A = this chain, B = another copy of it.
Amino acid sequence: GAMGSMERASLIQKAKLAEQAERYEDMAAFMKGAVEKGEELSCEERNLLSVAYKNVVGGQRAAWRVLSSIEQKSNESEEGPEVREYREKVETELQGVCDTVLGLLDSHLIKEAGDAESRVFYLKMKGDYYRYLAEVATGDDKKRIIDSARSAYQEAMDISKKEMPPTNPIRLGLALNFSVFHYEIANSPEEAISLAKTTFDEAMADLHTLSEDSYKDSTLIMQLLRDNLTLWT
């Protein structure tokens, strides 16, 4: 790829610069290049990868929702194909980004990740990007896309429960996202609420073990679980 000639360390340095410049497409390209060097990623590097693609796909998803809403209102209205065409364009670009991320996870980040922190991180990302594919899916394969998200989240949950404390921020963000998966993808709002509550309560009971800085990190994510519970109940 286009980043094959750049040093791994230079790609990581430039990913950090792109983050500071809010140039997230560049950031994602640099981190894709770094992954393709073939070496495992550090905790910091995994976060750079996640931040870059989160922001890229987040813009695409927000645009897709705007266009989908316009398209829906047009199908209630004065009549052409332009709205559908442009929604499809954004959708296809979004699917391409999701496919690229899933391809990095499959070649070969997940299979080389042996530590719980790295393996859970990548399986959570796999669930997230199948979930984003599920958000726009409508055809023969929607159920398989949903089950791919579920399966990745479930394996991440199983490992995280066995190997990480209940306040671990990756464990908490995994549970947050699997809860949202249940609520709005799988049509299982009770499972979503149950998971958010049990996750919150088990984290609260472990806070006493933490330093001041870890306490801040954990309670930040616990508040997101609380926000969703307040929205859903």
Q: How far is the CA of A70 from the CA of B18 in the complex (A)?
A: 12
User: Which residue of B21, B67, B70, B85 is within 8 Å of A63 (Cβ)?
Assistant: B21
Indicate how many identical chains form the complex.
2
Which residues of B have CB within 8 Å of A139?
Answer: none
Q: How far is the CA of A174 from the CA of B126 in the complex (A)?
A: 51
Q: Which of A9-17, A116-124, A129-137 contacts the other chain?
A: A9-17
A66-89 Cβ-contact flags toward B at 8 Å (1 or 0): 110010000000001011011001
Could you tell me if B10 and A82 are in contact, using CB atoms closer than 8 angstroms? yes
Q: How far is the CA of A67 from the CA of B90 in the complex (A)?
A: 29
Could you tell me if A22 and B70 are in contact, using CB atoms closer than 8 angstroms? no
Could you tell me if B90 and A23 are in contact, using CB atoms closer than 8 angstroms? yes
A153-196 Cβ-contact flags toward B at 8 Å (1 or 0): 00000000000000000000000000000000000000000000
A43-65 Cβ-contact flags toward B at 8 Å (1 or 0): 00000000000000001001100
**Minimum C-beta distance from A20 to chain B (A):** 6
Could you tell me if B20 and A86 are in contact, using CB atoms closer than 8 angstroms? no
Could you tell me if B22 and A82 are in contact, using CB atoms closer than 8 angstroms? no
Q: How far is the CA of A72 from the CA of B86 in the complex (A)?
A: 42
Nearest residue in B to A14 (C-beta to C-beta)? B86
Which residues of B have CB within 8 Å of A26?
Answer: 86, 89
Which residues of B have CB within 8 Å of A14?
Answer: 82, 85-86
Residues of chain A at the chain B interface (Cβ within 8 Å) = 10, 13-14, 17-18, 20-23, 26, 59, 62-63, 66-67, 70, 80, 82-83, 85-86, 89-90
| A-B pairs with lowest CB-CB distance, top 10 | A21-B63, A21-B66, A13-B82, A14-B86, A10-B82, A23-B63, A17-B86, A14-B82, A20-B66, A21-B67
